[PDB]
């Protein structure tokens, strides 16, 4: 029982663009920082971008200038606009609430798959 669902992944060539979306229960989303994470095979999910309920955003250096995170508070939905995609962006992407402390032990949705062809 998770309260999140991601969509919008696809296969694209390098230089392409995608827009991911995640709809979440208001009880997870409302008033709370939300983030996009990505996972490649064998590895932990790594946070990519985060957005506060007051629209403050954070990004890992390697996606700055390329990705944009946003939220629609009336639909409890978070978005990740992914431009200038690179093979190093190939991963399963997940959204979740961004809690204090380490992220271990949360329940996750199914993710959405993004492949950027070599």
Author numbering: 3 to 120
From the paper:
Activity-regulated cytoskeleton-associated protein (Arc) is a multidomain protein of retroviral origin with a vital role in the regulation of synaptic plasticity and memory formation in mammals. Arc has an N-terminal domain (NTD) involved in membrane binding and a C-terminal domain (CTD) that binds postsynaptic protein ligands. In addition, the NTD and CTD both function in Arc oligomerisation, including assembly of retrovirus-like capsids involved in intercellular signalling. In order to develop new tools for Arc structural and functional studies, we produced and characterised six high-affinity anti-Arc nanobodies (Nbs).
To further characterise the Nbs in their free state, Nb E5 was crystallised, allowing for structure determination at 1.42-Å resolution. The structure shows the typical immunoglobulin fold, an incomplete β-barrel of nine anti-parallel β-strands. The overall structure is compact, and the three CDR loops extend from the protein. Despite its elongated nature, the CDR3 loop is rigid in relation to the rest of the protein. Hydrophobic residues of the CDR3 pack onto the exterior of the central β-barrel to shield non-polar side chains, which might account for the high solubility of this Nb. Furthermore, the two tryptophans and the basic residues in the CDR3 loop suggest a negatively charged, buried epitope. The central disulphide (Cys24-Cys97) appeared mostly reduced, possibly due to radiation damage. Upon further inspection, it became clear that it was partially oxidised, and was refined to 20 and 80% occupancies for the oxidised and reduced rotamers of Cys97, respectively.
